[PDB]
Enzyme design. Structure first.
Site, short mmCIF file in Angstrom:
data_model
loop_
_atom_site.label_atom_id
_atom_site.label_comp_id
_atom_site.label_asym_id
_atom_site.label_seq_id
_atom_site.Cartn_x
_atom_site.Cartn_y
_atom_site.Cartn_z
N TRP A 132 0.83 -1.22 0.00
CA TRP A 132 0.00 0.00 0.00
C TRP A 132 0.86 1.27 0.00
O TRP A 132 0.57 2.22 -0.73
CB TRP A 132 -1.02 -0.01 1.15
N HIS A 159 7.38 6.96 15.29
CA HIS A 159 6.88 5.97 16.23
C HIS A 159 7.84 4.81 16.45
O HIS A 159 8.57 4.42 15.54
CB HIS A 159 5.53 5.43 15.80
N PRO A 187 6.69 0.92 15.49
CA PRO A 187 5.69 1.44 14.54
C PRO A 187 4.60 0.44 14.16
O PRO A 187 4.69 -0.74 14.54
CB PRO A 187 6.52 1.86 13.33
N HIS A 239 8.46 0.66 7.49
CA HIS A 239 8.97 1.53 6.43
C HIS A 239 8.86 3.00 6.83
O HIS A 239 7.79 3.61 6.69
CB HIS A 239 8.40 1.26 5.04
N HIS A 241 8.39 6.42 8.25
CA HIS A 241 7.33 7.42 8.09
C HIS A 241 7.33 8.32 9.34
O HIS A 241 7.51 7.81 10.45
CB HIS A 241 5.97 6.74 7.87
N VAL A 242 7.22 9.64 9.17
CA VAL A 242 7.23 10.63 10.26
C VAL A 242 5.87 11.26 10.42
O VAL A 242 5.23 11.64 9.43
CB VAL A 242 8.29 11.72 10.00
N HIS A 243 5.45 11.43 11.67
CA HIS A 243 4.21 12.07 12.05
C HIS A 243 4.43 13.55 12.20
O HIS A 243 5.46 13.98 12.72
CB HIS A 243 3.68 11.52 13.36
#
Ligand code: 31G
Lengths: 288, 287
Positions: A127, A220, A223, A227, A229-231
């Site tokens: 996805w 996180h 997580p 893969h 990913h930043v919040h």
């Protein structure tokens, strides 16, 4: 006006919220679910009873301070009783919240326990791949630095309805495949992170006119998927993920990697796990 | 019993969180701040009233139906915290000003924050009184009375102790002088390890709550400048567990062990009220 059924038989407590003063309860009748919420105070009803003589019971008194246990009249005793009758297992699923247990993972605990476990459970991140190659959610892309290595894609989170700034929840994804988690980070990853930090916030300040000082930029650990990913959340917004036992500020993830290069590879990381999660027991066991 | 004074005269409402079911009110009596908190439910007292005949009033019906409920006296509890007298410094801490994040480098503290705090912060005296057993003496769950490496474990004002779900305890060090997380050097390492392990063990004895159910953090910037360690139940969405304020004791210790000058030089992130003057002093120092 009354009860939809005849008598309740509490089986299990689905969800709890001590901060919100709410209780979620499953029960067998004649299956059904009952929810109770303590109603928030009314400025007038409260002020009026205050100038009078209310029932107070001293818990303790230190310095200028003192706490009391109060019992107000019927008008201030309201509780929200939401009843779902009937209910099934596909409703017990997304309405029950599990137990949480904290675990501290050493540099070696990951290398020797967590990582081989994660390598066992074949996770699908197709996805994500599809978002990165513009095969999916292409329209939602707020920003992109398409550098293959140091590049990323800034998209708003799917649950964010984008109708207000208050609940701003954006999520960036690096173009470079292979960075699983915060533990895979070495100084070679520093430029990709700095772009995600500065370039993202600037994409936000141009598209939403929201200053850096109004933004929480965290990673996180552990997580939801593996893969990098930043919040990017609005500061005033408090949503499970900003919790100290999971969030790691990008500003510091960078400052750390700058100081100790082998930092996130050796340093002991703290995070919580579901009681049901098998990994939790594998670490509890490795640590005895 | 009755209020510490004679009658209340509502001035202004400090804070009103509908999500949290709490009200902050200021009233002249002199001055006095009164706080009311709707108590979180108790598994037993709720289940018991459920199997019975409760008072319900139908708001609406879809299979979604809502009711207005009126429970007996036991379930009618409200947390009434009274601050009498309340100075203009109390009357500002409790208002709701837009939050702005700020990153303080080592030198920013040394040259800006610290001299500001030295100008004045808050009256500690309530802490001092707890430490010298002058106040809340009975509520003390644990004490390691070593003057240097010692502390006191007492449950928080923000805890009615009627349930484990919202478990909030503290570990105030006996050693006067440690203002904040920035005052910490390797000489404070045994003091912290004492509040880590000894704290959790006094919790596991008194409340039979394992370490894996506990969040042990420090605040930065704190409410009062005298080293205190938060001990919260994990499941509880504790106001102060936010990454922009909380620092896990487990890691404060690990970082001190690695870099001795760590909390003296390393850049710390925290948010400040738009109204807070310090915020502007740093914004200004950074331009
Ligand atoms: S006050 O303005 O209400 C205030 C300022 C800063 C910090 C606090 C902390 O809470 C308490 C104050 C006084 C007594 C007390 N006793 C105990 N055991 N726990 C806490 N948490 C407090 C208040």
């Amino acid at each position: 006006v009354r009860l939809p059924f005849s008598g309740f038989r509490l089986q299990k407590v689905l969800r709890e919220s001590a901060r919100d003063k709410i209780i979620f309860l499953h029960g067998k009748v004649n299956d059904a679910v009952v929810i109770l919420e303590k109603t928030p105070f009314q400025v007038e009803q409260v002020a009026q009873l205050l100038t009078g003589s209310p029932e107070l019971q001293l818990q303790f008194s230190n310095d200028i301070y003192s706490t009391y246990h109060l019992f107000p009249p019927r008008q201030l005793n309201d509780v929200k009783t939401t009843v779902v009758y009937p209910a099934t297992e596909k409703h017990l699923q997304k309405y029950l919240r599990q137990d949480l247990r904290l675990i501290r993972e050493t540099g070696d605990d990951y290398r020797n326990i967590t990582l081989p476990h994660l390598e066992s459970q074949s996770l699908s991140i197709q996805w994500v791949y599809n978002i990165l190659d513009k095969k999916a959610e292409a329209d939602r892309i707020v920003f992109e630095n398409p550098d293959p290595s140091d590049g990323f894609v800034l998209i708003p989170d799917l649950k964010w309805n984008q109708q207000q700034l208050d609940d701003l929840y954006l999520i960036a994804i690096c173009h470079r495949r292979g960075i699983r988690s915060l533990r895979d980070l070495t100084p070679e990853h520093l430029p990709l992170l700095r772009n995600i930090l500065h370039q993202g916030q600037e994409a936000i300040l141009q598209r939403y006119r929201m200053k850096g000082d109004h933004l929480r930029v965290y990673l996180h650990y552990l997580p939801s998927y593996y893969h990098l990913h930043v919040h990017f959340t609005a500061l005033g917004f408090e949503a499970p993920g900003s919790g100290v036992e999971r969030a790691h500020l990008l500003a510091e993830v960078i400052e750390n990697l700058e100081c100790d290069p082998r930092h996130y590879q050796q340093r002991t990381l703290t995070f919580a796990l579901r009681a049901d999660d098998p990994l939790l027991k594998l670490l509890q066991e490795a640590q005895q």
